[PDB]
Amino acid sequence: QFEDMEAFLRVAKYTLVKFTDMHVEMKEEAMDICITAVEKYPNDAEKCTQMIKDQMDKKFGAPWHVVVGKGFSYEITYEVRNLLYIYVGGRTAVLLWK
Amino acid sequence: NRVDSNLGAISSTLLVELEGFVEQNRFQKKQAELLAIRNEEVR
Amino acid sequence: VDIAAVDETFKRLQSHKGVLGIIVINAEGIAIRTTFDNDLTVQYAALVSHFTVKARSAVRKLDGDNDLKFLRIRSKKHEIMIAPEFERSHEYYLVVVQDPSRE
Amino acid sequence: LTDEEMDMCRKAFAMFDKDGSGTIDTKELRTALSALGQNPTEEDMFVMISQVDQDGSRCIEFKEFVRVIQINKQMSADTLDAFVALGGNLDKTGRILVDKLRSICEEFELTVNVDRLVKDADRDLNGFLSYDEFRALL
Amino acid sequence: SDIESTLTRIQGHKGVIGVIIVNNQGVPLRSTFEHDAMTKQYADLVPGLADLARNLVRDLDPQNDLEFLRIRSHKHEIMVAAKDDFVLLVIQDP
Amino acid sequence: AVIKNADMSEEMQADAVDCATQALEKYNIEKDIAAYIKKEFDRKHNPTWHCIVGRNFGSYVTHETKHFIYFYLGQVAILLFK
Amino acid sequence: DYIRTVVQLGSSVEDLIKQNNAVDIYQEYFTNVTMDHTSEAPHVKTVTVFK
């Protein structure tokens, strides 16, 4: 029972997947590339999404769609087996759909 | 106690427990004596 | 100059017990004077702007000729106080944050 | 969907993945089947897991566990047990044979019984019980 | 016999015009009004404000919650005690 | 209303703004806002849209030639596209 | 006009802040007091008489 934001940030380093319809190798590759994006540029998040979907653009699919953020809402139409929603760093969260 | 620690535990038992179900038969021997025993003291 | 008067009002309010913060935000959700850092500022400005326009629309809908000059939400930590003055050429819902636990 | 089904689901998931891997591997599953007596092939269990494994893991987990319990349970509360008590052996006809009740009281060897119950639960006042008045009995 | 005695005390002070209890989704149970053309008004307008305010408070630092709320209009003081089971309303002009 | 970036016909930019503003006026939560803004425009013009509502979000997305709109109202942000 | 509004609101809120410091309304007495003084006289129970 920690007693501030800061001890929460001390514990919260895990990257829990909130909900996901992805293959296990799909999941591990996408999960690790997103954590490397978030650790690479905490300040400017635009070019995190640059890197995430352009890697997924050349490799996995011609269409892709990345949303990183702090507080937001969304409703998308997505073709099944290709959706990733994860919580990174105990605060920042990323939606990702094709 | 002697007239209502019995009669609120006699009504707390569970006869059948969790083919081989003959063990249940054997099991239902044992607790039978239980209720009989308890009843005698209340009588 | 009246700028000394309004800054003096900030020390009038802020000299009270427990008063953590004072901030002024206009109808377009942008803070003007602060007392906090910049991001707690902008998240207060956005949140309180949306919340108070919903609350005023609630009271006006509930009764036609009654408006609000007051708003007070509670925490277990700090009792945010919102005041609005809905008018034309000015509508400045100032918002205080305070609590009587400290000091 | 409910809250105690999560309790039983957690207990049964504990029973299956008994070593503590966090994933149902084939060997613990066969251990569970062999405790129940079954020792099938090593190609049918593959197909069974492959239908239950959605993630490609070759190992099923708690989300997949409750997915299969969810589909099998809610696809197929008090309607069925009181229904199939005696009238559900009649399937929306409302006429229960007295001979069924005489047989029930015959087999369970009960010491003293008079069947005045069916005489005094008679709400159509004919000599049988429809289903709504059957629940009124219960 | 403690809840209703507090209702009877609180509804007989110098400014109170109505006490309302409403459930999670709705169903205003145990109002106090001689007609019910404006109870439903409160019951479907106010808990939107109560949970919207819980959003405003809790968003800042998630150890935090909301407990009460007051809206003082010109002629009314709408005090709402929101919590997990229900929403409760007391209306009073000072 | 405030628009920061868009490349689409203005005659339905007016459609976008009048669709979003009455939505923001009516509802009192921000999931149903992104619900309605897609839903009603979806039954208006095209089969496919995507719409984001919030504050301080980052995104990269492939544009559409005449379907890409980035609103701004009252420190509450909206994006929608095809 | 902005200045006049701000000082008007400062006056009103100043009254309110005093109102909250005056007496604290939101404070339950004995929120958490564990120490309880109770009844502890000797109890004699005959569980069974062995006869």
Resolution reading in Å: 4.0
**Residue at C69: amino acid letter:** K
Q: Which residues of A touch E63 (CB under 8 A)?
A: 3-5
Contact C43 F76 (CB under 8 A): no
Region label for F74, one of left (φ > 0), alpha (ψ between -120 and 50) or beta (otherwise): left
Q: How many CA within 13 A on the CB side of residue E37?
A: 1
Helix (H, G, I), strand (E, B) or coil at D32: helix
Q: Which of residues 5-24 of G touch C (CB under 8 A)?
A: 5-10, 12-14, 16-18, 20-21, 24
| Contact in structure between C96 and G17 (CB atoms under 8 Å) | yes
| Contact in structure between C34 and C14 (CB atoms under 8 Å) | no
**Tokens representing residue C27 in the block:** 């109808």
- Number of neighbours of residue F54 by Cβ within 10 angstroms: 20
Any G CB within 8 A of C72 CB:
yes
Our CA angle for E48, E54, E60, nearest 5°, is 140
Contact A25 D55 (CB under 8 A): no
Contact F35 A75 (CB under 8 A): yes
Q: What are phi and psi of C100, to 5 degrees?
A: -90, 10
| Contact in structure between F52 and A74 (CB atoms under 8 Å) | yes
Q: From CA G14, how far away is CA G18, in angstroms rounded?
A: 6
**Residue at F47: amino acid letter:** P
Q: From CA D125, how far away is CA A78, in angstroms rounded?
A: 63
| CA dist C38 → C22, C30, C32, F25 (Å) | 13, 11, 11, 28
Return the H-helix or E-strand segment holding F53. strand F50-61
Helix (H, G, I), strand (E, B) or coil at C77: coil
Mutate to test the interface with A, among F24, F39, F53, F57 (most CBs of A within 10 A): F57
* Count of the separate structural domains present in chain C: 1
Give the CATH number of domain A5-97. 3.30.740.10
User: The sheet that has E87-92: what strands, in order across it?
Assistant: C21-24, C94-97, C81-83, C71-73, E69-72, E77-82, E87-92, E16-22
Q: From CA E69, how far away is CA E49, in angstroms rounded?
A: 9
Q: From CA A39, how far away is CA A59, in angstroms rounded?
A: 22
Residue in A with minimal Cα distance to E60: A5
| CA dist A39 → A34, A45, A51 (Å) | 9, 10, 12
Experimental method: cryo-EM
Distance from the Cα of F46 to chain C's closest Cα (Å) equals: 31
| CA dist C53 → A5, A57, E83 (Å) | 30, 42, 23
Distance from the Cα of F26 to chain C's closest Cα (Å) equals: 10
Any G CB within 8 A of C2 CB:
yes
The conformation of residue G3, written as its DSSP 8-state character, comes to H
CB-nearest to F74 from C42, C43, C49 is C49
**Tokens representing residue B7 in the block:** 């009669």
Q: Write out the DSSP string of E41-90.
A: HHHHHHHHHHHHHHHHHHTT-TT-----EEEEBSS-EEEEEE-SS-EEEE
Cα-Cα-Cα-Cα torsion F12, F16, F22, F26, nearest 10 degrees, comes to: 140
Q: Which residues of A touch F56 (CB under 8 A)?
A: 69-72
Q: Write out the DSSP string of D37-59.
A: T----SSHHHHHHHHH--SS-SS
The binding site of D consists of: 17, 19, 21, 23, 28, 53, 55, 57, 59, 64
Q: Are strands F68-72 and F2-6 parallel, antiparallel or unpaired?
A: antiparallel
Sign, CA dihedral E74-E79-E82-E85, equals negative
**Tokens representing residue D88 in the block:** 């559900």
The binding site of D for Ca(2+) consists of: 17, 19, 21, 23, 28, 53, 55, 57, 59, 64
Contact C/F (≥3 CB pairs under 8 Å): yes
Least Cα distance to B38 among D26, E79, G48, F11 occurs for G48
User: CB neighbours of E15 closer than 8 A, spacing ≥ 6?
Assistant: E77, E92, E93, E94
Three-state SS for G10-51 is HHHHHHHHHHHHHCCCCCCCCCCCCCCCCCCCCCCCCCCCCC
Return the H-helix or E-strand segment holding E5. helix E3-10
Cα-Cα-Cα-Cα torsion E9, E13, E16, E19, nearest 10 degrees, comes to: 0
- Number of neighbours of residue A12 by Cβ within 10 angstroms: 16
Q: Which residues of F touch A66 (CB under 8 A)?
A: 59-61
Owning domain of residue E10:
1-94
Any A CB within 8 A of F75 CB:
no
- Number of neighbours of residue G37 by Cβ within 10 angstroms: 5
Helix (H, G, I), strand (E, B) or coil at D77: coil
**Tokens representing residue C91 in the block:** 């509508």
Our CA angle for F13, F4, C31, nearest 5°, is 125
Max Cα distance, chain E (Å): 43
* Count of the separate structural domains present in chain E: 1
Distance from the Cα of A10 to chain F's closest Cα (Å) equals: 23
User: CB neighbours of C81 closer than 8 A, spacing ≥ 6?
Assistant: C71, C72, C95, C96, C97, C98, G13, G16, G17
Contact D/A (≥3 CB pairs under 8 Å): yes
